[PDB]
Design a protein around this ligand. Structure first.
Ligand code: 5LI
Ligand code: NI
Length: 194
């Protein structure tokens, strides 16, 4: 299985582990994890975070043939579990570093937001221009590796990134949220970031 292969001590996640559009796993709703977590589920989260760190390092990214990422969801590794990793750099070194189990948005703002530069996805080997319309602010519940519950409030980039990853575990892709008619339409209440 993907999870057994990926969580071997020796395994380094790379682009060959990441499934792409057309693979039905990306359009499936991922299964909640149960507590306590298995060793494999804990290792998986750690491997995912390690990947993000590798992807954000000039030398390692070059060597491993990695595209940079600020988030990753297990379904991207063909693992249909509700596990995501988020690694958003500050302009510590990170605005947000978290491995989240069963993350869930429990509140969101009326105001929407979108990155002015649009979004991309490691599972999408093409550019899809347009404003990816999301909630400006979210309150997110999740469990950490110890089954401890966290409730965090996110805004700006962090909010966008976490929503992108939660979308994956719900079978949603970033372009599902771009206005087909006018990709760069600026609706009332839409905050353009950057
Ligand atoms: O699911 C995660 N990925 O596919 C990694 C590649 N995309 C990104 O890092 C990314 C890029 C721009 C905006 C957002 Cl919100 C994200 Cl998440
Ligand atoms: Ni993605």
């Amino acid at each position: 299985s993907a999870i057994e292969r990926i969580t071997k001590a020796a395994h380094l996640i790379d682009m060959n582990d990441i499934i792409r559009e057309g693979n039905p796993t990306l359009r499936t709703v991922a299964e909640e994890v149960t507590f306590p977590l298995s060793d494999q589920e804990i290792i998986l989260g750690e491997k995912m975070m390690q990947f993000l760190k590798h992807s954000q390092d000039p030398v390692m990214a070059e060597k491993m043939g990695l595209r940079g990422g600020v988030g990753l969801a297990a379904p991207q590794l063909d693992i249909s579990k509700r596990i995501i990793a988020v690694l958003v750099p500050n302009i510590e070194a990170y605005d947000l570093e978290a491995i989240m189990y069963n993350p869930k948005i429990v509140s969101h703002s009326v105001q929407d937001a979108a990155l002015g530069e649009g979004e991309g996805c490691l599972s999408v080997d093409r550019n899809v221009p347009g404003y990816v319309v999301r909630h400006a602010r979210v309150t997110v519940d999740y469990f950490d590796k110890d089954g401890e519950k966290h409730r965090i409030k996110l805004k700006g980039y962090n909010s966008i990134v976490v929503q992108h990853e939660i979308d994956h575990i719900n079978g949603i892709m970033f372009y599902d949220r771009i206005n087909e008619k006018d990709p760069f339409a600026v609706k009332d209440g839409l905050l353009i970031l950057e």
